[PDB]
Nucleic acid binder design. Structure first.
Lengths: 68, 68, 68, 68, 68, 68, 68, 68
DNA sequence: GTGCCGAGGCCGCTCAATTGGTCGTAGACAGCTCTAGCACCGCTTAAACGCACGTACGCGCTGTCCCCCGCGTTTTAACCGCCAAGGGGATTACTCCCTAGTCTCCAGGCACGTGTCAGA
DNA sequence: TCTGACACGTGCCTGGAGACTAGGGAGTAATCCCCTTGGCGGTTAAAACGCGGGGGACAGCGCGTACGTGCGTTTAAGCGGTGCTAGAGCTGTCTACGACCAATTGAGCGGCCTCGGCAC
């Protein structure tokens, strides 16, 4: 519920940033920080989609929500 | 390289934010925006870890890099 | 509290940047903008130092906080 | 020219941000980082003042240059 | 809304930079990167024009906003 | 050669940024500033594509070139 | 330390340039110039490698960065 | 080769710049690049010194030859 | 308010990667002992702040004319489709040639004793 | 011409740069076959320029803000030195990540329907 993404994908991201070693707690904390920040953008994008008069969230509503 | 996470996971997050329908272009854009922002936090967490004299990125380095 | 630096020092900076004349209201606004931006870098450098396990803010912590 | 502000004023700023102890090399580095960022805002505020048709830098200008 | 310029125009620019072949995905990403950077210069040029006391954005307002 | 894009499209961009009136000399200067900054990104994306050993410029080459 | 090469080798280079005497100040300035020009090439060498797919920055990567 | 930096110290420079693996050919080319730029600076630095009516090469001379 | 077609929802398979277990051993934390370098208090001088007078610049008022907005016709191109091919990609073998542990050596690096060598 | 501050050369103590000899990670040619770009042709759409009306931007004089100079008072910042707190370096214990391996969860990809999104 706190980490929505797969741990192996969040770990690959921290290793491509240059991390020589990555603690499983750091993978769990990065998963939580990506999930929380993603839920915030998606919640605001859903309100932009409905203000625009549509049920579907589309690329422009994610792009505009991220620029807030 | 552009979208690090699995699309069905990023889609589940947008549907739990309340979306009634989700365009595949919104799933791809959210995957890119999460990847870019996650790489920014991870790259700075790695410089904090190496400054604390450690090779391992740990929970505290991710927490501190996100509050920047 | 709003302008931490001496006004004659902030005025000397705006005059060395090329200003032919400097209004007292521009010296006070620059003093506030330097105080606010300096407090933001120092507050994160103190958290960068306490994470490293030290009480003393050193050149490396200010350098790392300014690159955030 | 390297550090424009008074060292005891830059140190008081780092101590009000919460630092328990401050290294003299951190006071000099903060003085350099404030001087460099202050010269960037003053140099662009002087070009805004001159574009507006005036010799005097005024509060308005420093406000517009800082938001760049 | 994401790509303001004509695709055949963005593509001619990439082919004049020396590209032997250009992916349609690269034309649409270049169009988005030019549109976002152009909107940022124009938004700040509009604030420079209004600070100068005018409604009309002129050559000097675009030139000053780009040097920021 | 100095302005690659259509003037009516560069003008639409400055009007969508909030401009109440836009001078023809500002449309031409914005067209030149977008063309020059666009040629710089495209020249570096062509070199990234050729280092990677491919004649085709692709989305990842434009994305990596713009982040420089 | 600002020098990547050993001070004695920066001094030996100044002597090969015809200087009958080289000040300790000239040795430190030479070390800094070689450090700056070195890092500015190494960064581009790392980019050439990562772009070609290879993890090893080979001889081509150095020659290509020195002209880039 | 005929380099000024020590071979394993030109190598340490490339690795310290971020190299994951360094080809022993690039160690040699880096040493050549540092040697060539070194001589090209020393010759001009020696001329500027002899012009100023001094014999001991000083920081000022190298600082000016590098800024040219 | 009405018609049409984008393009997402829903479904079923399977294979590809994720999560879980257990082993090895690299690394991170705690503890001792010493040195680095900071906080405190003190002196005295630098230079900051605040007048008071002067006068340069700025902000208005307003009246010319610059030059942009609206409206419009023309035709120059950008978008699209269909058809052809070249290219880039994934899957493979073989052979580079760097990482690695182990090693000897050249010459890097700091101190001691002298005259250099830059100035009014 | 007239001339006195403080850095430099040569030796000793010391180490990290140079160099294997070998293992095997990853670099880079082969090839086969989908992806997807180039290419040619048609056509409407939307970009350019042209005229007319008039909104607002640029210049000129007046008046009055308010910044510059010069000066005095004094409150700070700076530099020394004391003296003691905390950070660094070495070392040892032990914790927890990298690694290989299993196996089954669940993500991706068509293929078929029809809800709602886009223009008139």
């Amino acid at each position: 519920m706190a980490g929505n993404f797969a741990n192996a994908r969040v770990e690959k991201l921290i290793r491509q940033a240059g991390a020589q070693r990555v603690s499983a707690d750091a993978v769990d904390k990065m998963n939580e920080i990506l999930t929380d920040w993603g839920k915030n953008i998606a919640k605001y994008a859903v309100e932009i989609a409905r203000h625009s008069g549509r049920k579907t969230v589309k690329e422009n509503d994610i792009k505009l929500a991220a620029q807030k």
